[PDB]
Amino acid sequence: MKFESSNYRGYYIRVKSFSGRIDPYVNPVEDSMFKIVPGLADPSCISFESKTYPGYYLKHENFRVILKKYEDTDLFREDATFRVVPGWADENMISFQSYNYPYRYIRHRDFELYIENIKTDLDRKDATFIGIKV
Amino acid sequence: MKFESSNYRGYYIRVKSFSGRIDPYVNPVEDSMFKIVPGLADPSCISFESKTYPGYYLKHENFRVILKKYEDTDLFREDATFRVVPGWADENMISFQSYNYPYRYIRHRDFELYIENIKTDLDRKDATFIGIKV
Amino acid sequence: MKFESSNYRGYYIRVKSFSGRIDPYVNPVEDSMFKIVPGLADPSCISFESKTYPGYYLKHENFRVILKKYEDTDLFREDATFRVVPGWADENMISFQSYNYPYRYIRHRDFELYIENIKTDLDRKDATFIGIKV
Amino acid sequence: MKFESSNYRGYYIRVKSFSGRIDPYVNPVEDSMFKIVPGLADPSCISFESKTYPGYYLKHENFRVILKKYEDTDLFREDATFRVVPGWADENMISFQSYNYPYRYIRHRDFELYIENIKTDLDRKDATFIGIKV
Amino acid sequence: MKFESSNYRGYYIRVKSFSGRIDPYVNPVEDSMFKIVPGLADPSCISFESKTYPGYYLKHENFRVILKKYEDTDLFREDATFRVVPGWADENMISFQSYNYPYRYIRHRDFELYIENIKTDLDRKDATFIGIKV
Amino acid sequence: MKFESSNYRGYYIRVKSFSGRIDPYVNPVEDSMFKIVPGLADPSCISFESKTYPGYYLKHENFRVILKKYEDTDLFREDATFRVVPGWADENMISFQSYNYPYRYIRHRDFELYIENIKTDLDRKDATFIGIKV
Ligand SMILES: OC[C@@H]1O[C@@H](O[C@@H]2[C@@H](O)[C@H](O[C@@H]3CO[C@@H](O)[C@H](O)[C@H]3O)OC[C@H]2O)[C@H](O)[C@H]1O
Ligand SMILES: OC[C@@H]1O[C@@H](O[C@@H]2[C@@H](O)[C@H](O[C@@H]3CO[C@@H](O)[C@H](O)[C@H]3O)OC[C@H]2O)[C@H](O)[C@H]1O
Ligand SMILES: OC[C@@H]1O[C@@H](O[C@@H]2[C@@H](O)[C@H](O[C@@H]3CO[C@@H](O)[C@H](O)[C@H]3O)OC[C@H]2O)[C@H](O)[C@H]1O
Ligand SMILES: OC[C@@H]1O[C@@H](O[C@@H]2[C@@H](O)[C@H](O[C@@H]3CO[C@@H](O)[C@H](O)[C@H]3O)OC[C@H]2O)[C@H](O)[C@H]1O
Ligand SMILES: OC[C@@H]1O[C@@H](O[C@@H]2[C@@H](O)[C@H](O[C@@H]3CO[C@@H](O)[C@H](O)[C@H]3O)OC[C@H]2O)[C@H](O)[C@H]1O
Ligand SMILES: OC[C@@H]1O[C@@H](O[C@@H]2[C@@H](O)[C@H](O[C@@H]3CO[C@@H](O)[C@H](O)[C@H]3O)OC[C@H]2O)[C@H](O)[C@H]1O
Ligand SMILES: OC[C@@H]1O[C@@H](O[C@@H]2[C@@H](O)[C@H](O[C@@H]3CO[C@@H](O)[C@H](O)[C@H]3O)OC[C@H]2O)[C@H](O)[C@H]1O
Ligand SMILES: OC[C@@H]1O[C@@H](O[C@@H]2[C@@H](O)[C@H](O[C@@H]3CO[C@@H](O)[C@H](O)[C@H]3O)OC[C@H]2O)[C@H](O)[C@H]1O
Ligand SMILES: OC[C@@H]1O[C@@H](O[C@@H]2[C@@H](O)[C@H](O[C@@H]3CO[C@@H](O)[C@H](O)[C@H]3O)OC[C@H]2O)[C@H](O)[C@H]1O
Ligand SMILES: OC[C@@H]1O[C@@H](O[C@@H]2[C@@H](O)[C@H](O[C@@H]3CO[C@@H](O)[C@H](O)[C@H]3O)OC[C@H]2O)[C@H](O)[C@H]1O
Ligand SMILES: OC[C@@H]1O[C@@H](O[C@@H]2[C@@H](O)[C@H](O[C@@H]3CO[C@@H](O)[C@H](O)[C@H]3O)OC[C@H]2O)[C@H](O)[C@H]1O
Ligand SMILES: OC[C@@H]1O[C@@H](O[C@@H]2[C@@H](O)[C@H](O[C@@H]3CO[C@@H](O)[C@H](O)[C@H]3O)OC[C@H]2O)[C@H](O)[C@H]1O
Ligand SMILES: [Cl-]
Ligand SMILES: [Cl-]
Ligand SMILES: [Cl-]
Ligand SMILES: [Cl-]
Ligand SMILES: [Cl-]
Ligand SMILES: [Cl-]
Ligand SMILES: [Cl-]
Ligand SMILES: [Cl-]
Ligand SMILES: [Cl-]
Ligand SMILES: [Cl-]
Ligand SMILES: [Cl-]
Ligand SMILES: [Cl-]
Ligand SMILES: [Cl-]
Ligand SMILES: [Cl-]
Ligand SMILES: [Cl-]
């Protein structure tokens, strides 16, 4: 899957230099592709496995979303697990709730990805994405 | 209404993940159904309202044709307004002229929809559709 | 939510002067109201956040249940995390197992709240409550 | 591997007199067993090789699914290649998309196997199978 | 809950490829875990909901016990409803009476699960299970 | 008699869903009580009869210690007979030697009971108990 920003249409979640961001015209395009697997800490949730680096996962660290090779620890698995919920800014879209910080959601901010509290209308838009099957 | 491609018969304009494309055997079939209303920026034109998502309209953005929730601005309304003209490759069919970019028409290219300049014979066929009432 | 004692109907869990007890005719009634949040030490458990004082949680300290402002330590979060299990004195009601003392449960005694081992029939009634949504 | 019909539980894909069908209580049971090999026309897909007759493959011909001895042609290899997709009638089961007819899927009809367009709810169930390792 | 066979101790009811059976050393072990809910056709009975596949239930079909996604029909709900009774071979254990075939009980036979009439001492043991809370 | 673990004091051998384990605060307490009778296969040894379930005995099966209704076979009696010996980790306490597997002793492991070889210092403690008359 790829994931498009709802308020920056044409921009996709991607990994660059092992950090998460959103970008248009993602090059290489595989940087925006993920294998969605049952959540490492909770199978009702999801984890994002990198397509170009198998065994690496999106995960938060100091509340920034980075890409990191799997580590056999509860904290890594919990940092790498996200619950898909109806989109904050549009219930027909999606948002990603952090498993171990349930009041923080994946959002972009100056085009970089964080997990942060969602309080304003701009926060909600920044936290709302479109899932695309490739 | 559904809209069938004239050079890919059996392929229909449809929304997938809030983006416009043409596909055959559209699943679910409602993805290819639209409520045609008077153009949001000009009643002599038309706008394509989603049957699945009322209040969402086909609209161009970065010249890509996408589905987006109605916004109360002139630019959104214009981006969502299209003039039905006689088909570029066949006057018995129709083409869709963009209200705010009059030299650009809805066309498919690698099965995704854009508003682009119609120059060659392939361009004309890619921009020529058949309107089917349902 | 509010929580009514099973063996003292009309007595609800409440905070008074930042310590936990059960009282009837709770004045002000907001003292008996809690926001049930994901468990601070484990999201599959619960914590009781004060409605009157956001950011304050019921938690045990020297095995007394008190209300205390959040502190960013593992011990505080574990002291503030409880597992909802079927009621000791009635399986259709509920009891609250301590996260870090798994054989101690919230119970009243002289109308004050403790986490204690649950041994007698009176112990079980003292540890059994009725959840009431508000 | 054997493949059980999702709507006719206990009915398995089997070869009878070199023709594909679904049957209960398959005798000999080897007629329902296949070696899943890299797709003859595309190693990222699959082909079904006969366990009873090595070098024979399930392949479609005039849209009927039959068992045929390998032939060294592009058409044969394409007729014998299928893509495993999430099941039409259940995402946790599987369906088999034809490699050279990408909008046709293996389905049973009067207990015989075809590749056909999948339009109705009955079509989707007829096209949905349960893989069973042996 | 999981459910252990009384005459094959260490063998548990589990789902494998959407069919019920008993197996030792169940892998993955969640295949043997169920959420016990009020009977879909009668609240005084029980239904077994899959932990692995939420919204899927154990239900009999041609008297075989299978796993199937919930369907909004009386027949499905009745096929998925079972009454817990004292065990046929041991009153301290349990058996499962079919709601709509009241003389048929869940039993294993060649390690596969059916609902069948219980007549012999072997039948009774085959229909007697141990409930284990997990 | 009850039998307390030497390395987990306050934890007692008990039967839960007809399987052997050690638990503190055993509930109901009769789950930890046994009638010590002369060994079923050798009256100079002992067998543990259930107080809750007269005629049921602790016995090993697949080297797991379980509770099972008496069976009139030599193998059952052999599986249910144990010899009290000086404790592996404390000669003032006791251990239980399997009668038909004389190098295997009752030990707890992840709080469940097995008959296993006693090799390490952890093994010896896991195999050492305090008998308490009731
Ligand atoms: O994303 C939120 C949590 O952050 C990680 O845990 C952090 C941990 O990374 C942090 O380490 C800091 C990093 O900066 C150094 O200069 C400092 O010395 C060091 O202590 O400590 C706080 C802790 O919360 C988790 O992966 C994630 O859950
Ligand atoms: O991720 C894209 C958008 O980025 C955020 O909005 C930014 C906003 O953060 C930025 O403000 C800058 C921040 O740095 C300050 O020093 C500066 O003064 C200020 O102008 O302005 C641009 C805007 O795009 C949104 O969260 C997100 O949508
Ligand atoms: O489909 C044609 C027109 O495209 C949209 O307008 C675009 C607009 O999206 C674009 O915004 C850019 C975003 O990136 C910034 O760096 C830049 O400064 C900003 O201008 O601007 C170009 C414009 O063509 C309209 O919806 C649609 O009419
Ligand atoms: O929308 C369906 C048809 O797509 C266009 O024609 C395409 C054509 O674009 C494609 O050429 C490929 C495109 O990707 C490039 O990267 C590559 O270099 C080029 O070879 O060939 C297939 C054909 O389907 C038409 O506009 C439209 O009819
Ligand atoms: O409710 C059970 C546990 O009680 C608290 O832990 C206590 C801890 O508060 C106590 O600390 C004392 C504080 O005063 C100092 O002078 C003294 O040296 C120090 O030991 O020690 C006992 C311990 O049980 C926890 O919050 C809670 O888990
Ligand atoms: O929380 C309400 C109830 O309080 C406890 O029961 C109390 C009990 O503790 C109390 O016992 C006193 C102890 O002091 C002695 O001097 C006196 O004689 C004795 O009566 O008596 C009142 C009774 O309500 C329960 O745990 C709980 O239900
Ligand atoms: O299953 C779908 C396609 O069916 C086969 O292709 C058939 C082909 O076999 C058929 O050939 C006939 C054979 O007899 C000749 O006398 C006659 O001239 C010729 O037409 O023609 C139709 C075609 O669809 C493929 O194996 C398979 O892809
Ligand atoms: O492969 C098993 C099932 O077969 C199809 O459903 C059949 C259906 O085809 C059949 O209908 C017949 C059609 O012929 C008429 O003459 C007759 O009146 C009518 O009954 O009835 C049996 C039914 O099972 C499905 O595709 C497939 O599930
Ligand atoms: O487990 C007992 C019952 O089995 C299911 O109902 C069965 C049904 O599956 C079976 O279907 C056949 C399919 O072929 C058709 O030709 C025929 O008409 C039809 O009867 O029929 C018997 C019936 O008992 C129920 O889910 C369950 O109660
Ligand atoms: O589920 C485990 C046990 O299985 C049944 O007992 C079996 C018995 O059914 C089996 O007899 C075989 C069955 O398969 C036929 O092919 C064959 O004809 C017949 O001899 O023999 C093994 C025995 O354990 C019990 O109901 C159940 O306890
Ligand atoms: O606790 C140790 C010994 O275990 C019991 O006997 C076991 C026996 O139950 C087991 O036999 C099964 C028979 O069914 C087959 O399908 C299976 O392959 C086989 O493992 O095998 C081990 C044997 O020792 C005794 O009661 C006890 O002494
Ligand atoms: O019966 C209670 C005790 O259980 C056994 O020891 C357990 C041990 O089996 C369990 O395994 C873990 C696995 O993860 C590793 O990282 C960890 O170090 C390892 O110990 O851990 C808990 C421990 O209590 C003993 O036989 C028995 O005393
Ligand atoms: Cl994808
Ligand atoms: Cl219409
Ligand atoms: Cl041209
Ligand atoms: Cl509430
Ligand atoms: Cl609330
Ligand atoms: Cl309880
Ligand atoms: Cl296989
Ligand atoms: Cl193989
Ligand atoms: Cl599909
Ligand atoms: Cl497969
Ligand atoms: Cl359970
Ligand atoms: Cl039950
Ligand atoms: Cl009975
Ligand atoms: Cl005694
Ligand atoms: Cl010894």
PDB file of C-alpha atoms in Angstrom, chain B:
ATOM      1  CA  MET B   1     -24.873   8.125 -15.331  1.00  0.00           C
ATOM      2  CA  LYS B   2     -21.807   6.064 -16.212  1.00  0.00           C
ATOM      3  CA  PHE B   3     -19.187   7.025 -18.779  1.00  0.00           C
ATOM      4  CA  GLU B   4     -17.614   4.444 -21.073  1.00  0.00           C
ATOM      5  CA  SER B   5     -14.328   4.929 -22.912  1.00  0.00           C
ATOM      6  CA  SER B   6     -14.731   4.897 -26.691  1.00  0.00           C
ATOM      7  CA  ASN B   7     -11.317   3.365 -27.428  1.00  0.00           C
ATOM      8  CA  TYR B   8     -11.484   0.947 -24.450  1.00  0.00           C
ATOM      9  CA  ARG B   9     -15.097  -0.220 -24.692  1.00  0.00           C
ATOM     10  CA  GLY B  10     -16.380  -1.807 -21.513  1.00  0.00           C
ATOM     11  CA  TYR B  11     -14.024   0.430 -19.500  1.00  0.00           C
ATOM     12  CA  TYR B  12     -15.821   3.006 -17.320  1.00  0.00           C
ATOM     13  CA  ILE B  13     -14.811   6.180 -15.531  1.00  0.00           C
ATOM     14  CA  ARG B  14     -14.604   5.258 -11.867  1.00  0.00           C
ATOM     15  CA  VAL B  15     -13.182   6.426  -8.559  1.00  0.00           C
ATOM     16  CA  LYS B  16     -10.687   4.245  -6.707  1.00  0.00           C
ATOM     17  CA  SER B  17      -9.113   5.542  -3.482  1.00  0.00           C
ATOM     18  CA  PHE B  18     -10.560   8.990  -4.274  1.00  0.00           C
ATOM     19  CA  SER B  19      -8.783   9.070  -7.658  1.00  0.00           C
ATOM     20  CA  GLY B  20     -10.230   8.944 -11.182  1.00  0.00           C
ATOM     21  CA  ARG B  21      -9.473   6.121 -13.610  1.00  0.00           C
ATOM     22  CA  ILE B  22     -11.090   3.826 -16.178  1.00  0.00           C
ATOM     23  CA  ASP B  23     -11.630   0.123 -15.470  1.00  0.00           C
ATOM     24  CA  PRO B  24     -13.776  -2.673 -16.872  1.00  0.00           C
ATOM     25  CA  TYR B  25     -15.965  -4.826 -14.607  1.00  0.00           C
ATOM     26  CA  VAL B  26     -15.958  -2.028 -12.030  1.00  0.00           C
ATOM     27  CA  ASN B  27     -16.147  -3.520  -8.523  1.00  0.00           C
ATOM     28  CA  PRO B  28     -18.065  -2.302  -6.717  1.00  0.00           C
ATOM     29  CA  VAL B  29     -20.173  -1.014  -9.635  1.00  0.00           C
ATOM     30  CA  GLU B  30     -21.252   2.116  -7.736  1.00  0.00           C
ATOM     31  CA  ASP B  31     -17.665   3.417  -8.144  1.00  0.00           C
ATOM     32  CA  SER B  32     -18.557   4.181 -11.797  1.00  0.00           C
ATOM     33  CA  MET B  33     -21.927   5.826 -11.076  1.00  0.00           C
ATOM     34  CA  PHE B  34     -22.308   9.594 -10.854  1.00  0.00           C
ATOM     35  CA  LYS B  35     -25.119  12.050 -10.240  1.00  0.00           C
ATOM     36  CA  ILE B  36     -24.718  14.707 -12.936  1.00  0.00           C
ATOM     37  CA  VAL B  37     -25.794  18.101 -11.606  1.00  0.00           C
ATOM     38  CA  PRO B  38     -25.505  21.610 -13.112  1.00  0.00           C
ATOM     39  CA  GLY B  39     -21.917  22.823 -13.123  1.00  0.00           C
ATOM     40  CA  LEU B  40     -20.938  24.272  -9.750  1.00  0.00           C
ATOM     41  CA  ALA B  41     -19.403  27.321 -11.476  1.00  0.00           C
ATOM     42  CA  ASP B  42     -21.724  27.509 -14.523  1.00  0.00           C
ATOM     43  CA  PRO B  43     -25.200  25.954 -14.860  1.00  0.00           C
ATOM     44  CA  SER B  44     -24.695  25.513 -18.610  1.00  0.00           C
ATOM     45  CA  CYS B  45     -21.937  23.040 -17.680  1.00  0.00           C
ATOM     46  CA  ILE B  46     -21.955  19.904 -15.531  1.00  0.00           C
ATOM     47  CA  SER B  47     -20.272  18.602 -12.406  1.00  0.00           C
ATOM     48  CA  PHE B  48     -19.851  14.933 -11.499  1.00  0.00           C
ATOM     49  CA  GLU B  49     -21.184  14.166  -8.028  1.00  0.00           C
ATOM     50  CA  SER B  50     -20.222  10.858  -6.468  1.00  0.00           C
ATOM     51  CA  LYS B  51     -23.092   8.479  -5.862  1.00  0.00           C
ATOM     52  CA  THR B  52     -21.119   6.680  -3.147  1.00  0.00           C
ATOM     53  CA  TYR B  53     -19.960   9.917  -1.449  1.00  0.00           C
ATOM     54  CA  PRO B  54     -22.617  12.631  -1.777  1.00  0.00           C
ATOM     55  CA  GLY B  55     -21.108  16.071  -1.594  1.00  0.00           C
ATOM     56  CA  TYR B  56     -17.882  14.859  -3.265  1.00  0.00           C
ATOM     57  CA  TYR B  57     -17.112  15.841  -6.849  1.00  0.00           C
ATOM     58  CA  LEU B  58     -14.708  14.902  -9.603  1.00  0.00           C
ATOM     59  CA  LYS B  59     -12.290  17.796  -9.854  1.00  0.00           C
ATOM     60  CA  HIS B  60      -8.864  18.415 -11.308  1.00  0.00           C
ATOM     61  CA  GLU B  61      -5.854  19.227  -9.126  1.00  0.00           C
ATOM     62  CA  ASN B  62      -2.320  19.398 -10.538  1.00  0.00           C
ATOM     63  CA  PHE B  63      -4.223  18.467 -13.745  1.00  0.00           C
ATOM     64  CA  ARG B  64      -5.062  15.046 -12.272  1.00  0.00           C
ATOM     65  CA  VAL B  65      -8.768  14.146 -11.983  1.00  0.00           C
ATOM     66  CA  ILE B  66      -9.594  13.182  -8.385  1.00  0.00           C
ATOM     67  CA  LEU B  67     -12.597  12.941  -6.085  1.00  0.00           C
ATOM     68  CA  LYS B  68     -12.688  15.640  -3.414  1.00  0.00           C
ATOM     69  CA  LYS B  69     -15.200  16.809  -0.836  1.00  0.00           C
ATOM     70  CA  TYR B  70     -16.948  20.036  -1.871  1.00  0.00           C
ATOM     71  CA  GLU B  71     -15.158  23.218  -0.766  1.00  0.00           C
ATOM     72  CA  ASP B  72     -16.926  26.606  -0.752  1.00  0.00           C
ATOM     73  CA  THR B  73     -14.452  28.442  -2.971  1.00  0.00           C
ATOM     74  CA  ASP B  74     -14.576  29.641  -6.557  1.00  0.00           C
ATOM     75  CA  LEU B  75     -11.472  27.631  -7.452  1.00  0.00           C
ATOM     76  CA  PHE B  76     -12.913  24.333  -6.215  1.00  0.00           C
ATOM     77  CA  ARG B  77     -16.199  25.007  -7.996  1.00  0.00           C
ATOM     78  CA  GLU B  78     -14.330  25.879 -11.190  1.00  0.00           C
ATOM     79  CA  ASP B  79     -12.002  22.853 -10.895  1.00  0.00           C
ATOM     80  CA  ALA B  80     -15.164  20.711 -10.651  1.00  0.00           C
ATOM     81  CA  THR B  81     -16.990  22.180 -13.664  1.00  0.00           C
ATOM     82  CA  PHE B  82     -16.883  20.695 -17.154  1.00  0.00           C
ATOM     83  CA  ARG B  83     -18.543  21.581 -20.453  1.00  0.00           C
ATOM     84  CA  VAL B  84     -19.923  18.650 -22.431  1.00  0.00           C
ATOM     85  CA  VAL B  85     -18.708  19.096 -26.014  1.00  0.00           C
ATOM     86  CA  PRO B  86     -18.998  16.831 -29.082  1.00  0.00           C
ATOM     87  CA  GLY B  87     -16.519  13.954 -28.879  1.00  0.00           C
ATOM     88  CA  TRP B  88     -12.997  14.700 -30.089  1.00  0.00           C
ATOM     89  CA  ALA B  89     -12.788  11.372 -31.965  1.00  0.00           C
ATOM     90  CA  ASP B  90     -16.511  11.023 -32.688  1.00  0.00           C
ATOM     91  CA  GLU B  91     -19.186  13.735 -32.814  1.00  0.00           C
ATOM     92  CA  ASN B  92     -21.786  11.147 -31.833  1.00  0.00           C
ATOM     93  CA  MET B  93     -20.005  10.844 -28.474  1.00  0.00           C
ATOM     94  CA  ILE B  94     -18.952  13.419 -25.875  1.00  0.00           C
ATOM     95  CA  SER B  95     -15.818  15.015 -24.475  1.00  0.00           C
ATOM     96  CA  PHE B  96     -15.479  17.062 -21.302  1.00  0.00           C
ATOM     97  CA  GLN B  97     -13.970  20.544 -21.473  1.00  0.00           C
ATOM     98  CA  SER B  98     -12.593  22.031 -18.267  1.00  0.00           C
ATOM     99  CA  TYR B  99     -14.383  25.237 -17.274  1.00  0.00           C
ATOM    100  CA  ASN B 100     -11.229  27.051 -16.074  1.00  0.00           C
ATOM    101  CA  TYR B 101      -8.764  25.425 -18.520  1.00  0.00           C
ATOM    102  CA  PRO B 102     -10.695  25.539 -21.814  1.00  0.00           C
ATOM    103  CA  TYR B 103      -7.877  23.921 -23.839  1.00  0.00           C
ATOM    104  CA  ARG B 104      -7.793  20.880 -21.531  1.00  0.00           C
ATOM    105  CA  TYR B 105     -10.208  17.940 -21.543  1.00  0.00           C
ATOM    106  CA  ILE B 106     -10.730  14.857 -19.400  1.00  0.00           C
ATOM    107  CA  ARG B 107      -8.683  12.027 -20.918  1.00  0.00           C
ATOM    108  CA  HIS B 108      -7.310   8.705 -19.738  1.00  0.00           C
ATOM    109  CA  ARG B 109      -3.596   7.875 -19.938  1.00  0.00           C
ATOM    110  CA  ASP B 110      -2.296   4.593 -18.519  1.00  0.00           C
ATOM    111  CA  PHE B 111      -5.931   4.224 -17.402  1.00  0.00           C
ATOM    112  CA  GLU B 112      -5.808   7.221 -15.013  1.00  0.00           C
ATOM    113  CA  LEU B 113      -7.697  10.457 -15.671  1.00  0.00           C
ATOM    114  CA  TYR B 114      -6.208  13.909 -16.329  1.00  0.00           C
ATOM    115  CA  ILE B 115      -7.244  17.161 -17.995  1.00  0.00           C
ATOM    116  CA  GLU B 116      -4.770  17.645 -20.834  1.00  0.00           C
ATOM    117  CA  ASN B 117      -4.258  19.159 -24.275  1.00  0.00           C
ATOM    118  CA  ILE B 118      -5.815  17.044 -27.038  1.00  0.00           C
ATOM    119  CA  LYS B 119      -3.344  17.039 -29.946  1.00  0.00           C
ATOM    120  CA  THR B 120      -3.046  13.603 -31.587  1.00  0.00           C
ATOM    121  CA  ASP B 121      -5.475  10.916 -32.728  1.00  0.00           C
ATOM    122  CA  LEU B 122      -4.754   8.929 -29.567  1.00  0.00           C
ATOM    123  CA  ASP B 123      -5.416  12.065 -27.498  1.00  0.00           C
ATOM    124  CA  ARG B 124      -8.828  12.482 -29.130  1.00  0.00           C
ATOM    125  CA  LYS B 125      -9.837   8.862 -28.562  1.00  0.00           C
ATOM    126  CA  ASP B 126      -8.585   8.974 -24.949  1.00  0.00           C
ATOM    127  CA  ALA B 127     -10.797  12.060 -24.476  1.00  0.00           C
ATOM    128  CA  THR B 128     -13.937  10.577 -26.056  1.00  0.00           C
ATOM    129  CA  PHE B 129     -16.582   8.884 -23.926  1.00  0.00           C
ATOM    130  CA  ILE B 130     -20.119   7.512 -24.111  1.00  0.00           C
ATOM    131  CA  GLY B 131     -22.672   8.676 -21.575  1.00  0.00           C
ATOM    132  CA  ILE B 132     -24.943   5.885 -20.289  1.00  0.00           C
ATOM    133  CA  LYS B 133     -28.002   6.618 -18.156  1.00  0.00           C
ATOM    134  CA  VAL B 134     -28.678   4.229 -15.270  1.00  0.00           C
TER     135      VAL B 134
END
